Amino acid sequence: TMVGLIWAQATSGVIGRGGDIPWRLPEDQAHFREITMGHTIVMGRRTWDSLPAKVRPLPGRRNVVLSRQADFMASGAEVVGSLEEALTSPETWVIGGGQVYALALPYATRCEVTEVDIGLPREAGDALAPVLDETWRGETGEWRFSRSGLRYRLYSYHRS
């Protein structure tokens, strides 16, 4: 059993605002699919609500949604009341959002982090990325360009 986290952040650490992600990076969809396809994905209820209906649930993955609400209906996902209840498959990828990343970081042995070269100053209410300590090791990838006009790069980090 392992847990990984996968997220994208601006250089400020902002990952979400107003119930959405404040940029688009279409080229990174392949990476997101390569990492998560065929595995369990776990997300917070707000992130589930943010998915367009076309990809709710995300196809080819076992979708799990965390909520404290008894009998919340998430058609296409299994709703659980604790993160630990979701960790039943060999590989579980936490796909957001801010609250669930913070909850899951202690359990994680991999982080796949896309850094987007955009200023995006923090504002009240923003969802923020977690911070990795010195227990993690890995590499920072080369800069890639997105047709959106932004450059981005991948940090692939891991620990025992």
Ligand X SMILES: NC(=O)c1ccc[n+]([C@@H]2O[C@H](COP(=O)([O-])OP(=O)(O)OC[C@H]3O[C@@H](n4cnc5c(N)ncnc54)[C@H](OP(=O)(O)O)[C@@H]3O)[C@@H](O)[C@H]2O)c1
Ligand Y SMILES: Cc1nc(C(F)(F)F)c(C(=O)O)cc1-c1nc(-c2ccccc2)cs1
Residues forming contacts to ligand Y in the complex (CB under 6 A) are: 29, 32-33, 47, 51-52, 55, 58-59, 95-96
Which does residue 32 bind out of ligand X, ligand Y, none, counting CB within 5 to 8 angstroms by kind? ligand Y
User: What is the enclosing helix (H) or strand (E) of 6?
Assistant: strand 2-10
- Out of 4, 44, 57, 130, the residue judged to bind ligand X by CB under 6 A: 44
Q: Which of residues 52-91 bind ligand X (CB under 6 A)?
A: 66-69, 72, 81-82
Tell me if 99 is assigned to a ligand binding site.
yes
User: What is the enclosing helix (H) or strand (E) of 104?
Assistant: helix 98-104
Nearer to ligand Y, 22 or 159 (CB): 22
Tokens 């990984």 label which residue?
4
Give the C-alpha distances (Å, rounded to integers) separating 43 from 38, 114, 119: 16, 18, 26
Q: Any residues with CB less than 8 A from the CB of 22 and at least 6 apart, and which?
A: 10, 14, 16, 120
Tell me if 81 is assigned to a ligand binding site.
yes
Enumerate the known binding-site residues: 6-8, 15-20, 28, 33, 44-47, 61, 66-69, 81, 95-101, 114
